[PDB]
Design a protein around this ligand. Structure first.
Ligand code: FMN
Ligand code: FMN
Lengths: 187, 187
């Protein structure tokens, strides 16, 4: 019996966005376990701004219905079936949202915290062999989709995480050395 | 140098925001190494929107000066000394910033990537026994501060990381079960 002492550096660097999943079953209790660990994200004044909708199994069709009903007839003709088939061969979706504070600093802080929570989650999931992609784009800003999944105005969708077990890790893309993006002032 | 954690979950759960630092010196090369690990955050379209200014040693006085110059003479006289003493007993500050895309979607994605980069750095640093706090608030939105550090309009400061070795930190605050802020759509 050997316990492993993996540097979190390894997880951070090995994590990949995964967009295609095996038909292996993702346990709900595992996702809840991971999300609970993710809640240890920094968050100003302990506002804990993050909230979630988890769509799994038959429920995923409800999300799909909200997605499709939000498209113009042209988008829908283009991506409807494609996207429906994709969502339905993805074990879980997690819509991550927050109440939008009318004030810049508090909203930015909340959004920062909500992104830290999602990144935590992605790291936590990678560790157990779960892949995921953090989705954005115009769908998340579409008032038709937002009402369609039961959110009110002034609730912001930070991301939709698509999650499941996967066959092969996608390849990485080399990062720019931080020294090209930084000034050092030892002046 | 390496790690005694048996899970990344533990690093995530045990990380604390640290505000007071010991006088132990912090390696500039170490901070750069950690920053380079942090760049493995998700970032839509491989935009890598993060940029940094690292203030270390005598360089910190430049930062302190920018801060004090953004204050009224009243603030300066009252706070100025206690502020300098604190910054100058903080081994390092990193101002993390981005260029603002005129478009909401790309901008928010870039902000979220940058927040994910910063949370990565916090966890990477905790691993090495380095504490920090992500400072936000009005200083970062003050046009006199922003100019003072050499930033232009449309360059958003996402946080200032204050970083050092430490021997005390705030007690961890109990998190709200995620079950209290989620809905499961099972059918
Ligand atoms: C973007 C954002 C802004 C923050 N701003 C500040 C701040 O301005 N001043 C401060 O002392 N801490 C700041 N922190 C607060 C701590 O990160 C937060 O209180 C933390 O969650 C406290 O519990 P912790 O020890 O688990 O991190 C900020 C965190 C986030 C993510
Ligand atoms: C806020 C944010 C939004 C993203 N949105 C999408 C998305 O809309 N669709 C997608 O395929 N990937 C999305 N990603 C992933 C990126 O497209 C990008 O390829 C990836 O993060 C870089 O590769 P990696 O995550 O495997 O390291 C997003 C990442 C971030 C941080």
């Amino acid at each position: 019996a050997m316990t492993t002492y993996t540097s979190i550096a390894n997880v951070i660097k090995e994590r990949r966005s995964v967009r295609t999943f095996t038909d292996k079953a993702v346990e709900k209790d595992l996702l809840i376990e991971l999300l609970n660990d993710a809640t240890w994200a920094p968050n100003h004044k302990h506002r804990e701004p993050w909230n979630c909708k988890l769509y799994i199994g038959e429920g995923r069709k409800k999300l799909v219905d909200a997605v499709l009903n939000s498209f113009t007839e042209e988008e829908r003709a283009k991506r409807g079936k494609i996207l429906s088939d994709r969502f339905l061969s993805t074990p879980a979706q997690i819509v991550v949202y927050m109440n939008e504070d009318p004030r810049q600093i508090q909203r930015d802080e909340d959004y920062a915290a909500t992104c830290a929570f999602m990144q935590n989650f992605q790291l936590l999931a990678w560790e157990r062999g779960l892949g995921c992609v953090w989705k954005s784009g115009g769908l998340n800003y579409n008032p038709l989709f937002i009402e369609g999944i039961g959110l009110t105005r002034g609730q912001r969708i930070v991301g939709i995480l698509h999650i499941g077990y996967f066959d092969k890790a996608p390849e990485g893309k080399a990062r720019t050395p931080i020294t090209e993006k930084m000034e050092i002032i030892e002046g």
